[PDB]
Design a protein around this nucleic acid. Sequence first.
RNA 1: GUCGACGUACUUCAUAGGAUCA
RNA 2: UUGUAAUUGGAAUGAGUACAAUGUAAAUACCUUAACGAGGAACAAUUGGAGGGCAAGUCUGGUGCCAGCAGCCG
Lengths: 553, 283, 29, 56, 38, 360, 86, 14
Amino acid sequence: ERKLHVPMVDRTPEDDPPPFIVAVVGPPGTGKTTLIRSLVRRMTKSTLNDIQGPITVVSGKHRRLTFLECPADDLNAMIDIAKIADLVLLLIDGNFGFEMETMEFLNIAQHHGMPRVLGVATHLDLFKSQSTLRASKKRLKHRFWTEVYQGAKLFYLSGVINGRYPDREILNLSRFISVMKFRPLKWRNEHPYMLADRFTDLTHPELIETQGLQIDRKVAIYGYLHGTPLPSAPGTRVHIAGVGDFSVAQIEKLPDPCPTPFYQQKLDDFEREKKLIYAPMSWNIGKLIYMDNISPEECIRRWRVDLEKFVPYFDTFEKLAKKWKSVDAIKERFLGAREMNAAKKEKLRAQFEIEEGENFKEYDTWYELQKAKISKQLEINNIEYQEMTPEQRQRIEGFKAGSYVRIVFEKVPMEFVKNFNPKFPIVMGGLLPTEIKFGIVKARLRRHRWHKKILKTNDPLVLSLGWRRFQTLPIYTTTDSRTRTRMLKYTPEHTYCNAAFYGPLCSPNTPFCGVQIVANSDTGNGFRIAATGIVEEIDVNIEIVKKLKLVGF
Amino acid sequence: QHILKNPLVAQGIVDKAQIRPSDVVLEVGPGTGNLTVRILEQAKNVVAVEMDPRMAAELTKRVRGTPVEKKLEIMLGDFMKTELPYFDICISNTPYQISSPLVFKLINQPRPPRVSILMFQREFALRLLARPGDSLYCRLSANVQMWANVTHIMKVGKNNFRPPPQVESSVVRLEIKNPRPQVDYNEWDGLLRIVFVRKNRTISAGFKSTTVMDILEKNYKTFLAMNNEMVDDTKGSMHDVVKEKIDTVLKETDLGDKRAGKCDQNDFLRLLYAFHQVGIHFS
Amino acid sequence: FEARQRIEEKNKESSDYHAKMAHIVNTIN
Amino acid sequence: KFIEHQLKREERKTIIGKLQDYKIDTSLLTSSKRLGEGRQTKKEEFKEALSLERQG
Amino acid sequence: FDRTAKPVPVITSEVTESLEDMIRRRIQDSNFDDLQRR
Amino acid sequence: KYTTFQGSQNFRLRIVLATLSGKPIKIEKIRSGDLNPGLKDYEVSFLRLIESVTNGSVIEISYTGTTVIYRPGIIVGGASTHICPSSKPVGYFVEPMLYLAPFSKKKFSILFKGITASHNDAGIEAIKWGLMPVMEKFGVRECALHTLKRGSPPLGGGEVHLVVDSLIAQPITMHEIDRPIISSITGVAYSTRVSPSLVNRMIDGAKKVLKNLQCEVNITADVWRGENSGKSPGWGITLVAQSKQKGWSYFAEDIGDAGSIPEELGEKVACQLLEEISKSAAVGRNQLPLAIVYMVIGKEDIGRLRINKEQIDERFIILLRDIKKIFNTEVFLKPVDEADNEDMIATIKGIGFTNTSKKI
Amino acid sequence: KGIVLEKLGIESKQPNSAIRKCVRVQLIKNGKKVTAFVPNDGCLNFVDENDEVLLAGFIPGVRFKVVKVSGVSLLALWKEKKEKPR
Amino acid sequence: KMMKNKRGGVIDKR
RNA sequence: GUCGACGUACUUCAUAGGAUCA
RNA sequence: UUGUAAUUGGAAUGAGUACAAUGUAAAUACCUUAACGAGGAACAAUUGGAGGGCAAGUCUGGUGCCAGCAGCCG
Ligand SMILES: Nc1nc2c(ncn2[C@@H]2O[C@H](COP(=O)(O)OP(=O)(O)OP(=O)(O)O)[C@@H](O)[C@H]2O)c(=O)[nH]1
Ligand SMILES: [Mg+2]
Ligand SMILES: [Mg+2]
């Protein structure tokens, strides 16, 4: 029974998958940098003195990982990384205990789609008693089990020698990651996203001096694509977190800069027939239809009027009648209705299959039937793509995940180029048509259980919806027993309430989380996750009404 | 009289009628009109044959003051005696006393309905639905299967009707075959009547009866007269000739030792052809 | 005039609600 | 079942065609409905005599 | 603001047409519900 | 900013395509050189109808009327009545709604009033038996067109109600790589304000052409008389070749003018239906536009459709070019492995469109 | 295990009614449609369409109740001791 | 009733 | 095909009677 | 002479921390034990069930002012 699940489609490519994104998140000073150094040494036998931005490393014959250190002091970085992180190494200071950033990050992950979470405890050598060490491990493990799941693996790191952790448990951690498998998540399998691997400005220096630095820039972004394939044609709308929405000016695939050993062996095998680390930051009718210069009538004749006319063109009545004095030339289409007996039996079974074969044309569980239809369909996707030519393939499906691609954007704000920190990730996310539209969003929202204070109507709230983070003024409402939408003054203490706000639209059922403060200055000590909820409906208008009483004597 | 009151079975009946919007429906036994309103709702127009003037009047009052007025048409009389208009689909809950005539009349309509949904007594319905070799296979089964095809739609129990009858009921679909098979109704009926006196005996034993010999000999005399060949008309003149004819046809067809109840359509057709070949016409 | 329209509007809304409550309870059982 | 059904239909078609090959009217022919009677009234005898006289 | 009592009905042309359609339709078949002498 | 188009060509397709995509478009130079330039009355009314069935859409038409700006909103549908000008029949306005109806917030319940037939536009029976059956294959389970009143030209007066109960996230992915074995020929012959004798004469004429075939021929006779028969005399026939195997349907339709011989029209329509079957592989030319559009807006998947070389005509190319301009999707054609015939497989990768308007 | 198809009584006017607490669920094992109880309408907020629900034996005719949604105890969510992972 | 739940509209300048 | 038989599993209808009192 | 204390007094003690020693192959733990370790003794026991009461609040129905549903929303 526990084997059954909701059927889902995993868009991960069958060949050459992208490197898995590993986000090392934890409070400041917990040991994020050293853990990355300890791991990369094991997998590649080389020590990186300095790490900045994503680092792609080979982990096996056909497996690659991209390590990214989340800035501990930024909540925005915690939000967007939570959306794209395939695996999260949650760093916990064992001696001190859990922290807001740990609790805050998990809650963001829970609401935005849980990725694999692995707890890593550090500074355990600071303990002076073995008894208290064991007790502390027991308490942290159980609390960690409540957040993620019972029996979740939690690794223990004692101390740091030469800026490296002990070899033995790094082996345990390395093996655990290698055999890990990842669930198919709704959001990551329905939108294309890419983590920027390196950053470059293409603007001509002459333009910078003639007009001044204030001029908008042209920027190129290199990285690995993930999730659904990105369409090849330019003009696609994408959102860069913390920057805004842009259109893909140019896009072209590049050779993979960090090929996996299996890939290189096959490529070298191709040569016969006729490096482990990469951290830069640190007249065929089909063609005739699609040359617009040739007129359609010109196209037709070379290889051989309007849709207002629903009735198709026909030849004159007399010529058609002569053409069809006899019924021949279609008799195959119609049903027909000592040695010849076999010939009749040949004809008859054919007739039977047409008439009744389909009612007759098994898997044990209904779950398997759904999976088979998906898998059968995914097989059909692959087969024709293998028939497909590489160039025509890229034109149809676009750039598949795992492809290392250069993307060029116009009119990027200059402050992005100037105030560029390699530590902070740059996340590019594709946008569906509904994401572009702006309007009223109706959602079911509840105050977060750990947030001290209740929210207020017409009170600014930073919502994290899809790839985008923005501030709006929600209005919390009630159904009044499904009679009218009545404005509430505050959110309910311990239950949900309908909330309406203006902002970018999204598909219904899209989860989101809310925060009132994102700046470090106003962080204080309380929990910063303010609200959680699900978008229920998208519209252009709403009829919230408030109670008004007239008083007399 | 017995009146149905379970809405679900009636809804199923009207649904399985599959009445196209351009169809005219012959609704026999209007009764109060529970079926009639729904037939009117999804039909071009409806012709209703009622025997009781009071029930027809009550139907008129019930329908009065609705959109579906011009559609309904009510004929007053006895269903057999009336000569009916063209109709596309027949839906009936008529008294069972008229079950057997009704069927054949639908078969013998100049333009028979393509589909009809008829409610019949369970025993009668099974006899209509019996297949060769079954216990209840009878003359009705063979004849109706010649001229139509009958299938079972529902089994309707006693409790649905008030006051309860002493027998269960059922609903079947009757499909008159178009084109009508080109076999004379009279000859088929005569052969079957002679062969079905005791359906579990040999066909030969069916023919051994003396009155059958008299009828067949007179028929042979009449046929020989039609072909202008002279005949003596004596009572027993060709008893000995017709007897040999019957023996030879029964032997060569190999149907002599086969019980009528286990004979299918093709067996009877072969027997008819053989009897014609040797010169005997039944009806 | 507004009074008449509201009563008509409330009437249809109630009728549709009750009819839906009829369909739903038939389905669940 | 389908193949036997189709073979039976073909046999039926052939037999029915051969039946149309040889056909007559049935008005004068005595129906088998009389099998139970076994005795005729003077009215029926007179009707039979009139019919036979009309035949000749 | 809520109403307490049913509004006074208004005699629009459609209401008159419906009512007179009823009257005519009744008189066609002579459906009169009138008092009869005992 | 705006994807631009020229002329009145494929107006309904472009507006409908824009509505599904959500991408604003501009259509310019509409009949610039004609004596009466700009937008026609019926094609105004279509813009009104589009506005009614959606919310948030902005439609601007230029002062001279030769340019149109369309910024699509969400499809919401609802219950409404539309008065169709005599210049076009209801089929002109119903047909675009077949694209849009299944993807609405609320069920489409539109009552159309006006002429119900013409020589150039989809008839009622073409829609009922010829076009919606294609949608039902794509996952629109419940859809119906109710003919409350027939209206023949020139006075029309007909009334038809469109109801689309089925609301779906997106069309299913189609897989049709065979020639459907069409089993029977059905149809409807109808007439208004005239004697039944015409309808019977037409069924005769169609039967004469179709008697030589090896399948059923059963043509319905739908004679309309009285109040609901409209205001003008008229008569037409629709013959549908049905494949019960995969429920595919091939149809041809025409109507008669005053003084035309009923037998000849029956002969012509039966002959035209015979043309369509020869020229078709999986869907008819008159049905192909719906099939291609539905496949484009399916899940991010490739659907395979078999198309005959005869179907690759002027209309097919301009249709595909319009699709690429709006959706950037490319239709790929490959030869079939067979040598008996010359058909092609049309493979179209879906865009992953979903119904976001519907409340959950 | 089941898939939440719809919340049938979501539109019922009277709060905390028996109808409001019923959800139409697809049993993943066989695909048969069944109906399940939720402890209260407050818990109904957690349940939305297309999540996994674990059902256990219990408006007559409803014989099941939801005990876990998305792999988390419904009671725990009601007591504000866990978050539903999505 | 038509204007209650509308935001767009057709802008005819002719 | 809202087919028949059987097998299996469930639902349902048949509960009040004597004594005293008003 | 019954019930209630974020009232109040000085006595006791281990959960935990920890010199030491015992323990053990070496450790941890137990038993010991200097020295710390209690008033919300916040050093903050749980899992189920039953029953209330409240409003310028909300829904539904009607032999007026009522009844049902219910009530984190006044
Ligand atoms: N004793 C001890 N020191 C540790 C441990 N883990 C980290 N440290 C120390 O903590 C300091 C920070 O280590 P980092 O690797 O820089 O951790 P970080 O996440 O990069 O810290 P920031 O990026 O500066 O916020 C270093 O001096 C480490 O020696 C541990 O388990 N034990
Ligand atoms: Mg660091
Ligand atoms: Mg212990």
